[PDB]
Amino acid sequence: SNTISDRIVARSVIEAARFIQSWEDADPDSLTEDQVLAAAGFAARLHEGLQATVLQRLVDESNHEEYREFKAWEEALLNADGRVASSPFADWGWWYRIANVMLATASQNVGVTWGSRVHGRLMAIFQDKFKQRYE
Amino acid sequence: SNTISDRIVARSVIEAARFIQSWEDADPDSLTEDQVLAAAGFAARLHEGLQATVLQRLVDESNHEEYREFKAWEEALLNADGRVASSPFADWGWWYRIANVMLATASQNVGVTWGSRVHGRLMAIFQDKFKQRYE
Amino acid sequence: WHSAEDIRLLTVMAALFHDIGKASQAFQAKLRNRGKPMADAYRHEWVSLRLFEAFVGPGSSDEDWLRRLADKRETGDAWLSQLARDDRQSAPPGPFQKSRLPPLAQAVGWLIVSHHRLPNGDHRGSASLARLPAPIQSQWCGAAKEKAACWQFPHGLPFASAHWRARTALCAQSMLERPGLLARGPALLHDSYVMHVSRLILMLADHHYSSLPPNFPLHANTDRDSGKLKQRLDEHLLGVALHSRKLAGTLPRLERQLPRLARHKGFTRRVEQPRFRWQDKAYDCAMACREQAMEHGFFGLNLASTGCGKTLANGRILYALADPQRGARFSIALGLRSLTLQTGQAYRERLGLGDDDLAILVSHVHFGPLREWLGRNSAGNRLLQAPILACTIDHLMPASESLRGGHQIAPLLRLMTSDLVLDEVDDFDIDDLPALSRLVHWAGLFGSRVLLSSATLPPALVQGLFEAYRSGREIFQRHIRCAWFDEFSSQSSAHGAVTSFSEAHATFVAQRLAKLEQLPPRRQAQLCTVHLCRELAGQMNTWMADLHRCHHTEHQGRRISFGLLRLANIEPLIELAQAILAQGAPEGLHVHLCVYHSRHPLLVRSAIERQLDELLKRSDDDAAALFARPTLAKALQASTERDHLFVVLASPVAEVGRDHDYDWAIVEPSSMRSIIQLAGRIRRHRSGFSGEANLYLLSRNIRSLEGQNPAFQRPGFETPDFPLDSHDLHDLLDPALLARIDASPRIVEPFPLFPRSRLVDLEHRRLRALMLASLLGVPLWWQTPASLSGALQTSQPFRAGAKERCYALLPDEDDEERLHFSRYEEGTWSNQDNLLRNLDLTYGPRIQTWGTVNYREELVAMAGREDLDLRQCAMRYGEVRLRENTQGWSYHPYLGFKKYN
């Protein structure tokens, strides 16, 4: 199970479906404006839900698995917001994990397995769109 | 938390989004064919995932909350498949709970709170479409 | 082959039915379309079934329909007219639902209905399942205005074609001629063996037709291989019929034709060497069993004691089974999820059998009656041809129970060919064992006798195994004596009734129980206490320090011991390993650690297993030889310190498989099975007991230290509903169990247990809540036309719980020297890079690793031995199975893959 991702994706279904359907044919080397917007819109919705979960402590601290997995998201947030570091785009940091959730969404809904070309293009979009989401 | 619903909805995002977007304006007293199809398609996807979870025992029996909530879904299935009863459309039975998941999906994604008119119309659609889903 | 002529006729109907189902235009449009891909529409097989139904009914006597078919002139307007449309509107009578076809016709429809998939039904009712195939409706098909369009766009059905019509007429005439055949066929359709045979025949012919390259309009799919559509459906029907003719002939052929391994010098010969007596006795019983057994079938139990190597006994049974003709055929199916090349190789070495003689199913099989239909050079065919095939139980089980596809067909054919041997571990939970029993039952009926080496088998499970063959025997005779191998003696019972078999089981159990009652020569049980991995880890280290001093070998002033740390789950083992790495060895000691589990890539894991096997052979006065042996020599040269501990930290698969004898072990408890395996390892090869403790057991399952419940699961005999009152281990195991711990506890047949009174007791009860005793009875499945549907399988699924896909460290398509973590998709791999995190492990003072593997070196070795490209061959040989996890894995060369959190 990946219960934190499921909870956030399940509250992002409109954005998730729009992203999956928009990127079905996508060439990451030549994205349309609508493909960029669909990716940014899904990432922004995931970000909003994940930030809320972390800041509000929406977690069962007695659940050994859920609490550890929450702490990894919290660690990523602290490595983005300056409390531990200010590097939101670092490998395995906040936006990298959001890009991974987007890859997971495609895998678990339509059976497509995207790799470095898609993941790197997502990270480039996030760098362009979301620099101001953290100080 | 409602972890079983989240897991199933999170593997049904395309159907969930189609249903939410189709029913945004819907008058349950005069549905279009496309609104009926969007509801039936989401319900069928939820049904497939929930039946798989129950029959395959995709659950942690040591999790006091998850196991009890799994058992309620299992009880509903046994009250539909003949092992306990053959009444899939009874109040609080299998399809009634699926209609509730669809109401929850709208609440938790777009903040809309549907009531008896929508829920009863869903149950009528399910009666028309899914009589053969159980013996 | 009494039923063969009828089977062939039935097979010859099905392709024609399928083409007819094919006809509606929507399908033609889809073949035309290329893209975007169209929905179904409603399965083609289902449409064909409707077409078959429409001509005949309703309601027509089998004879009348055959007469219409057999006569050339008709017609064919009324038949063309007849078929019902579900749409326009709402309900239509379900085909075969009632008062429809003559039953033979229904069987034909099922055969036709079957090919796309086995039927699926939402209803789980027991009564409905027994009736089958009557309940099969829209849900079974798995399939509107689009449907009407599919029916329409037309144009021109079969029975217009000159060649197709004539063949059908001839078939009808043959059906009319065949004495007694129609009525019998109508009653029979239900019989499981017949249904299975028909399904098998249909899959192969269809595959052959698909493989092969005048005015007719209707047609088969194209686009995957050359654009546009190729061929015509009717030609396809003819081809299917031709194949059907040929498949029946081949089945009749195989026993004399089929590749067999026979008359091996070693298996026949008695074993001079000490401690081989039980196998010899079992072999001698073999002649009597064979005389009884071939005519009547064979159900054997090799219950030779755990911690004693099994190869000889199984080999003897196989040799015993056929003599001297048709030697030799059998398959050794191991109860592991994955078979490594090394394990198979070891089994082969045991049997003194050439690799070509023995095939390993690793799916690549390492080394034609079905050859003409079959691929000339293909793995499934190779597995069939080999005199013995090695692979595992799970794949065969999946083939026997398949939701869909030819692969199911090949698997069934494989199960069919001579007789399938299990190993014990597979059932796991009284229920999973029940699914295994169902597969075994389906298997016997094909006529293979399967022998179970029940070192740890519960009596009830054995009874269930005995029953399935019994149903199978009834099927098989139309188309039982059990021998208990023992070190002391083997007893064979020729018993008609399962209950009779059980008592015979009880009697056999009594003698074994008496042997157990003799105090065990080898094995001490320790109850200790853990004060999470690190807290446990320290305790484990203390235990290891204690055991080596107690149990070690000295040569020329130095002392070496070998220990086993068994953990239940990969993550916990990884944590323990990490704790060990940060900490050193204790003062004065050198610790060598080898991490062994199922996570690691398959080639590397196999290499590690082979190294362990080479290291862990133990013989009397073998300490000096061990010192001489290269790893030992290296350790001695390397470091001044006298005292060396070579230690394997392992999971359940390693525990389950490996002929390794260990000086001591520290074991995390998962059940009677964990205990038995540990005891065998504890005394693999060496006579005599110090009488000091050499085996240490822990208090609450690691989940229990977490406090997770039920404490024993995954694998736990315990289930949440069947709760055990007290978590603690010390209460759970009886003082007698504690002393001279031996299978005896498992072998019973122990009454009367208290739900929370005995951990073993709990296991027996759960296992029975499994078997004959949300529980669709296995007996019910045996009784009824389960074979028709996939309902029983859906009810009790094999490999329950999510299954990880399959991944590998792949050398890049362009550059051999760069590696990418990759996921197998569907005939190709997607970039893994993004997700997977790679982690170093710190090394403790006076600590190092052993039995490790460099991945690049392993790949090079694979390339050298198999003449493959590094990337392709390393794929082939470098898969690791993993439950999908969004953020990926950490990877360390020694430790394999661990999740994230």
- A24 known member of a binding site: no
d(CA C820, CA C839): 16
- Please tell me which of the candidates C830, C885, C888 has its beta carbon nearest to residue A114: C830
Give the CA dihedral C196, C200, C202, C203, nearest 10 degrees: 130
Using the Cβ of A6 and the Cβ atoms of chain B, whether some distance falls under 8 Å is answered with yes
Residue recorded with tokens 């029993």: C437
Q: How many angstroms separate the CA of residue A97 from the nearest CA in chain C? A: 7
Beta strand pairing status for C420-422 and C330-333?
A: parallel
Q: Across chain A, how many H-helices and E-strands are there?
A: 6, 0
d(CA C211, CA C374): 10
B11/A13 Cβ within 8 A: no
**Among all residues of chain C, which has the CA nearest to that of A76?**
C901
Six-digit token pair at B110?
């777009």
Q: SS3 sequence, C769-788?
A: HCCCCCCCCHHHHHHCCCCC
Task: For residue C710, say if its preceding peptide bond is cis, omega within 30 degrees of 0.
Answer: yes
* Contact assessment for residue C399 and residue C333, using Cβ atoms and an 8 Å cutoff: no
Residues of C in contact with A97 (CB under 8 A): 887
d(CA C827, CA C876): 12
Pick among A9, A11, A13, A21 to test the B interface (most B CBs inside 10 A): A13
Six-digit token pair at C792?
């029983």
Convert C796-806 to b/e letters by CB count within 10 Å (16 or more is b).
bbbebeeeebe
Sheet with C365-366, edge to edge strand ranges: C365-366, C358-361, C388-390, C330-333, C420-422
Beta strand pairing status for C526-527 and C695-697?
A: parallel
- Closest among C436, C459, C424 to C800, alpha carbons compared: C436
- Please tell me which of the candidates C834, C837, C901 has its beta carbon nearest to residue A119: C834
What is the three-class DSSP state of C898?
strand
In this structure, the answer to whether residues C243 and C361 fall within a common structural domain is no
A99/C834 Cβ within 8 A: yes
d(CA C687, CA C691): 12
Using the Cβ of C886 and the Cβ atoms of chain B, whether some distance falls under 8 Å is answered with no
d(CA C734, CA C739): 9
* Contact assessment for residue C537 and residue C572, using Cβ atoms and an 8 Å cutoff: no
CA C621 to chain CA centroid, Å, is 40
Using the Cβ of B86 and the Cβ atoms of chain C, whether some distance falls under 8 Å is answered with yes
Residues C852, C855, C861: CA angle, nearest 5 degrees: 95
* Contact assessment for residue C444 and residue C468, using Cβ atoms and an 8 Å cutoff: yes
- Please tell me which of the candidates B6, B13, B18 has its beta carbon nearest to residue A109: B13
DSSP C37: P
Task: For residue C169, say if its preceding peptide bond is cis, omega within 30 degrees of 0.
Answer: no
**Among all residues of chain B, which has the CA nearest to that of C719?**
B61
What resolution (Å)?
4.2
- Please tell me which of the candidates A2, A71, A116 has its beta carbon nearest to residue C834: A116
Chains near A with 3+ CB pairs less than 8 A apart are: B, C
Residue recorded with tokens 């010859």: C12
* Contact assessment for residue C728 and residue C756, using Cβ atoms and an 8 Å cutoff: no
Count of beta carbons in the 10 Å neighbourhood of residue C640? 6
* Contact assessment for residue A112 and residue A106, using Cβ atoms and an 8 Å cutoff: yes
d(CA B10, CA A16): 10
B1/A6 Cβ within 8 A: no
* Contact assessment for residue C255 and residue C4, using Cβ atoms and an 8 Å cutoff: no
Type of residue at C754: F
Chains near B with 3+ CB pairs less than 8 A apart are: A, C
d(CA C52, CA C65): 11
Q: How many angstroms separate the CA of residue B112 from the nearest CA in chain C? A: 30
Beta strand pairing status for C807-811 and C819-824?
A: antiparallel
d(CA C592, CA C646): 5
Type of residue at C666: I
Distances from the Cα of C267 to the Cα of C255, C274, C343, angstroms: 22, 16, 19
B7/A14 Cβ within 8 A: no
The helix (H) or strand (E) run that includes residue B108 is: helix B94-110
Residues C289, C294, C296: CA angle, nearest 5 degrees: 90
Residue recorded with tokens 């190597």: C309
- Closest among C50, C55, C28, C64 to C219, alpha carbons compared: C28
d(CA A103, CA A100): 5
Six-digit token pair at C679?
């005891």
d(CA C719, CA C433): 14
Write the DSSP assignment of C313-354 as a string of letters: HHHHHHHHHS-SSSTB-EEEE-SSS---HHHHHHHHHHHT--
Residue recorded with tokens 């080496």: C453
Bridge partners (DSSP) listed for residue C537: none
In this structure, the answer to whether residues C764 and C830 fall within a common structural domain is no
d(CA C584, CA C822): 35
B82/C774 Cβ within 8 A: no
Bridge partners (DSSP) listed for residue C421: C332
A14/B10 Cβ within 8 A: no
d(CA C145, CA C138): 16
Q: How many angstroms separate the CA of residue A94 from the nearest CA in chain C? A: 12
Sheet with C481-485, edge to edge strand ranges: C299-302, C481-485, C491-494
Q: How many angstroms separate the CA of residue C227 from the nearest CA in chain A? A: 21
Type of residue at A35: Q
d(CA C394, CA C400): 10
* Contact assessment for residue C418 and residue C448, using Cβ atoms and an 8 Å cutoff: yes
Give the CA dihedral C83, C84, C86, C88, nearest 10 degrees: 120
Give residue limits of the domains in chain B. 3-133
Q: How many angstroms separate the CA of residue A128 from the nearest CA in chain B? A: 27
**Among all residues of chain C, which has the CA nearest to that of A69?**
C901
**Among all residues of chain C, which has the CA nearest to that of B71?**
C721
d(CA C237, CA C20): 9
For residue B19, report the phi and psi dihedrals to the nearest 5 degrees.
-65, -50
Does any domain span residue C555? yes
The domain of C822 spans 807-898
For residue C888, report the phi and psi dihedrals to the nearest 5 degrees.
90, -150
* Contact assessment for residue C360 and residue C353, using Cβ atoms and an 8 Å cutoff: no
Residues C657, C661, C664: CA angle, nearest 5 degrees: 110
Distance between first and last Cα of chain B: 33
Bridge partners (DSSP) listed for residue C330: C388
* Contact assessment for residue C889 and residue C899, using Cβ atoms and an 8 Å cutoff: yes
Pick among B8, B33, B132 to test the C interface (most C CBs inside 10 A): B132
Using the Cβ of C95 and the Cβ atoms of chain B, whether some distance falls under 8 Å is answered with no
- Closest among C748, C262, C317 to C492, alpha carbons compared: C317
Count of beta carbons in the 10 Å neighbourhood of residue C839? 11
**Angle, helix C162-177 to helix C233-257, in steps of 10 degrees:** 40
In this structure, the answer to whether residues C115 and C232 fall within a common structural domain is yes
Using the Cβ of B79 and the Cβ atoms of chain A, whether some distance falls under 8 Å is answered with no
The helix (H) or strand (E) run that includes residue C553 is: strand C553-555
Residues B50, B52, B56: CA angle, nearest 5 degrees: 125
| Sign, CA torsion C657/C662/C668/C671 | positive
CA C44 to chain CA centroid, Å, is 31
Residues of C in contact with B58 (CB under 8 A): 800-802
What is the three-class DSSP state of C891?
strand
DSSP C588: T
- Please tell me which of the candidates C708, C834, C886 has its beta carbon nearest to residue A115: C834
Residues of B in contact with C137 (CB under 8 A): 132
- Please tell me which of the candidates A69, A71, A113 has its beta carbon nearest to residue C823: A113
Residues C462, C466, C470: CA angle, nearest 5 degrees: 165
d(CA C112, CA C48): 7
d(CA B78, CA C30): 40
d(CA C805, CA C38): 28
d(CA C463, CA C471): 13
Residues of B in contact with C794 (CB under 8 A): 55
d(CA B77, CA A134): 47
Residue recorded with tokens 């195989």: C254
Q: Across chain C, how many H-helices and E-strands are there?
A: 39, 22
* Contact assessment for residue A57 and residue A64, using Cβ atoms and an 8 Å cutoff: no
Based on the structure, what is the number of domains in chain C?
A: 4
d(CA C549, CA B26): 79
CB-neighbour burial class of residue B68 (10 A; exposed 0-12, middle 13-18, buried 19+): exposed
CA C27 to chain CA centroid, Å, is 37
Using the Cβ of C714 and the Cβ atoms of chain A, whether some distance falls under 8 Å is answered with no
For residue C240, report the phi and psi dihedrals to the nearest 5 degrees.
-65, -40
* Contact assessment for residue C44 and residue C151, using Cβ atoms and an 8 Å cutoff: no
The helix (H) or strand (E) run that includes residue C476 is: helix C459-478
* Contact assessment for residue C702 and residue C536, using Cβ atoms and an 8 Å cutoff: yes
Type of residue at B53: T
Write the DSSP assignment of C67-94 as a string of letters: HHHH-SS---HHHHHH---SSSSS--PP
Does any domain span residue C151? yes
Q: How many angstroms separate the CA of residue B9 from the nearest CA in chain C? A: 17
In this structure, the answer to whether residues C664 and C766 fall within a common structural domain is yes
DSSP C585: P
Residues of A in contact with B16 (CB under 8 A): 13, 17
B74/C774 Cβ within 8 A: yes
Which residues does C359 contact at the CB level (< 8 Å), separation at least 6? C365, C366, C367, C382, C383, C385, C386, C388, C389, C390
Sheet with C807-811, edge to edge strand ranges: C807-811, C819-824, C829-831
d(CA B55, CA B58): 8
Beta strand pairing status for C664-667 and C837-838?
A: unpaired
In this structure, the answer to whether residues C142 and C50 fall within a common structural domain is yes
**Among all residues of chain A, which has the CA nearest to that of C833?**
A116
Q: Which of C253, C286, C314 is the last residue of a domain?
A: C253
* Contact assessment for residue C667 and residue C654, using Cβ atoms and an 8 Å cutoff: no
d(CA C815, CA C831): 15
Six-digit token pair at B87?
């009444």
Residue recorded with tokens 């097989």: C45
Distances from the Cα of C644 to the Cα of B27, B119, C348, angstroms: 79, 71, 33
| Sign, CA torsion C597/C601/C606/C607 | negative
Half-sphere exposure of C755 (CA within 13 A, CB side): 8
In this structure, the answer to whether residues C129 and C197 fall within a common structural domain is yes
Give the CA dihedral C256, C261, C264, C267, nearest 10 degrees: -100
In this structure, the answer to whether residues C743 and C891 fall within a common structural domain is no
Residues of A in contact with B14 (CB under 8 A): 17, 20-21, 109-110
CB-neighbour burial class of residue C744 (10 A; exposed 0-12, middle 13-18, buried 19+): buried
A14/B20 Cβ within 8 A: yes
Pick among A109, A113, A117, A121 to test the C interface (most C CBs inside 10 A): A113
CB-neighbour burial class of residue C857 (10 A; exposed 0-12, middle 13-18, buried 19+): exposed
The alpha carbons of chain A give a radius of gyration, in whole angstroms, of: 15
**Among all residues of chain C, which has the CA nearest to that of A62?**
C706
Distance between first and last Cα of chain A: 33
d(CA C139, CA C865): 51
In this structure, the answer to whether residues C820 and C755 fall within a common structural domain is no
Bridge partners (DSSP) listed for residue C830: C823
d(CA B118, CA B120): 6
**Angle, helix A94-110 to helix B13-22, in steps of 10 degrees:** 90
Does any domain span residue C431? no
Half-sphere exposure of C455 (CA within 13 A, CB side): 24
A21/B109 Cβ within 8 A: no
Using the Cβ of A101 and the Cβ atoms of chain B, whether some distance falls under 8 Å is answered with no
B58/C802 Cβ within 8 A: yes
C774/B83 Cβ within 8 A: yes
* Contact assessment for residue C886 and residue C814, using Cβ atoms and an 8 Å cutoff: no
What is the three-class DSSP state of B46?
helix
In this structure, the answer to whether residues C787 and C814 fall within a common structural domain is no
Q: How many angstroms separate the CA of residue A48 from the nearest CA in chain C? A: 19
* Contact assessment for residue C65 and residue C38, using Cβ atoms and an 8 Å cutoff: no
Type of residue at C846: R
- A5 known member of a binding site: no
Six-digit token pair at B119?
């829920």
DSSP C801: S
Task: For residue C155, say if its preceding peptide bond is cis, omega within 30 degrees of 0.
Answer: yes
- Closest among C437, C233, C239, C267 to C348, alpha carbons compared: C267
Pick among B6, B53, B57 to test the A interface (most A CBs inside 10 A): B6
Count of beta carbons in the 10 Å neighbourhood of residue A55? 11
In this structure, the answer to whether residues C788 and C743 fall within a common structural domain is yes
| Sign, CA torsion A92/A96/A98/A102 | negative
Six-digit token pair at C56?
């005949």
Q: How many angstroms separate the CA of residue A13 from the nearest CA in chain B? A: 5
Does any domain span residue C456? no
Which residues does C247 contact at the CB level (< 8 Å), separation at least 6? C11, C200, C201, C204, C205, C373
* Contact assessment for residue C836 and residue C821, using Cβ atoms and an 8 Å cutoff: yes
A107/C884 Cβ within 8 A: yes
For residue C813, report the phi and psi dihedrals to the nearest 5 degrees.
-50, -35
Residue recorded with tokens 């320790």: C526
